[PDB]
Subunit: 117 residues, 4 copies
């Protein structure tokens, strides 16, 4: 179904952060990051359809959010090159992961909401 | 329709914050707060149906979230008595307000997402 | 200092300077009584609000005037102010740092509580 | 100090003590080279990582070992670590404070940038 969803919000304008690039990677045996999935956030600041229950196996994942391009398109010089979220996916009953990020030019926060559907 | 919605998240457990009391007030002419609407967050940490476009007129509003009772039910001693969000509602084209709060025992953050439907 | 306030600006990556802060204490008749007030300095800090002797048990409210701050920068923000409400000194005297991180449509506030 | 890190614990309302921090600089061949490392003190701060002369223009990565921190408190947290990546000193030398506020399933990070 949809075990992984990303949501991005803009704290300066009080809006979804639209057309933000997101790349997802999975840690491979050799300790390097392999591309796993990517997309751009929608009008509601969300990114759905990244993966399926079948492919989303236990492992270490990295979500990379291209925040710098977002701010530059608004004419604001930002501090970070990108925002990175790194976590382990653990089976333990059925799980859905929502990775949220709240963006300002010199600060971001990120939260994980993990629920059972 | 639904011009005002509240969403509450628990940063300690990575979950919606369920059964949290929320009270909404409107500032009256005499500079005091009059009850306006209230409820408890649902299973998804959300509170819908607080008001309608007709009643939600321009004005100063206060959203009060009973965070202290939430933490005490989990057995954690919290710092704040409650979280308060105070803002002006301004007509200027059609607007929907989402007030989000992210809770920890000694810290909270709150964000407003304002969109046009 | 038993009570210190620190304010940061998340848009500019700087301390938030000249921000007005008002502190109140809940009185016997359940009203907010003015307790202390001041403005943040060039480091984003406000010291000297009170003393150990005056800072008795009670419920306190720290009100930060965020709206005037953003307006003076040309930004029309969402919140009227940020309010932090807490019970203080109920297990004996402590030192409190109230920190606030400001953006136009979002803020966060954290408390650091230390035993002298 | 050109580079300082400060870490707070949002669950306990305290500085986050004994947190391991590793700093890297992107080298010519696009790999991360170790630059400096240390542990936060009793005030949640890490000073002395570098000097003005050594801290040249570049892309730096500050990695904070949040997972070990929470595990030692008995809490199984979400993130493996917190990473902050930024270009430094590209318009001349500046002083950087990297602050992080930790909860088990959430963190925030802020930069304060000052011109000496």
């Amino acid at each position: 179904k949809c075990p992984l969803m990303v949501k991005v919000l803009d704290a300066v304008r009080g809006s979804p952060a639209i057309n933000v690039a997101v790349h997802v990677f999975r840690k491979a045996a050799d300790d390097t990051w392999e591309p796993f999935a990517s997309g751009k956030t929608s009008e509601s600041g969300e990114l759905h359809g990244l993966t399926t229950e079948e492919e989303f196996v236990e492992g270490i994942y990295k979500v990379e959010i291209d925040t710098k391009s977002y701010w530059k398109a608004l004419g604001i010089s930002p501090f970070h090159e990108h925002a990175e979220v790194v976590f382990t996916a653990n089976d333990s009953g059925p799980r859905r992961y929502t990775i949220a990020a709240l963006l300002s030019p010199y600060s971001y926060s990120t939260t994980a909401v993990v629920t059972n559907p």
